[PDB]
Symmetry: D2
Subunit: 104 residues, 4 copies
């Protein structure tokens, strides 16, 4: 169980539901993610979660189990995650650097 | 060249640069993306682009070529893209539905 | 319409079907991919397609339209794509280099 | 620490190295992955790992730490992971079903 800091952007969708509309599933998991003390930011194509590796990946796993507990039979997830040793950077720090450079 | 409407969230990074810091590359490509008439939204883990398939995928390809033109030798990209026939939904519509349901 | 060579690994899934089992959809799209003259390699988590950017992204777009034509209401796709200017490398060349180094 | 079975296809790349060529990094991590008792399958665009969630995500985290221990300053990873309650399916079972259907 590694504890390295990481930034993980997750996009989770249910497979096999009766409708192409899945906002119920997204809202369901988002509420669960916001209950965690880990910092998270919701956007249109997913949610960015930050913190120690084990806690972040642990939460995503719990969300899957939560989905299954709520009746969803299959969950498909895409995770973009990065770790680095040169500096500590939150999701907000990341966008702040870009925005600054763009206006320059 | 398909023209179906699509929502594509792209995360692009350069491989082989001399530094772990890549905000220069991100800012460079973001400015190029904002020059397009296609609707785009920047977030911490990528940029969401919407429009006809050929125009969206065409732009991403142009960004790659632009990166190479600017000296970057290798570009690695992750794209999450979806198409649907039941309704038209922009990236903003998508987050709006979730936010509403979350407060309900 | 960029024509830079690219290697794209695609994972495509249908959203809103009546079953968690989606092998019918996968088989359907795979047969369509094999009809293209572009080089493709199927694996457990997707299919790797190579060739000019416009032809590769064009095919993926056609697959989406094909899915919708076959009754699927929503398609979600994850694409990992890379371009580079230092050498030409097929998907097979890529795995060959790794395998060699592993035994060394 | 969830223990639900999962199939995870991982694509890991180093950011900030002095070369666009990263086969050394890939070979390095692959050897580390093969030391694990977890079932893994290497392909051109990544490696598919299967097993309990905590063990699989734990290994990926260890690979990141291993990369940093070996001098790599930044690691970027894309993970496609799925869980389901309707059946147990390995990566090989997954491709076997498709291949069968394709010839039918």
């Amino acid at each position: 169980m590694p504890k390295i800091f990481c930034l993980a952007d997750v996009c989770m969708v249910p497979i096999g539901t009766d409708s192409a509309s899945i906002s119920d599933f997204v809202a369901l998991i988002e509420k669960k993610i916001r209950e965690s003390p880990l910092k998270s930011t919701l956007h249109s194509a997913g949610t960015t979660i930050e913190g120690p590796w084990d806690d972040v990946m642990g939460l995503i796993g719990e969300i899957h189990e939560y989905g299954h507990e709520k009746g969803y039979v299959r969950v498909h997830t895409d995770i973009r995650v990065g770790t680095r040793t040169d500096k500590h950077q939150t999701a907000q720090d990341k966008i702040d650097v870009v925005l600054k450079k763009i206006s320059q």
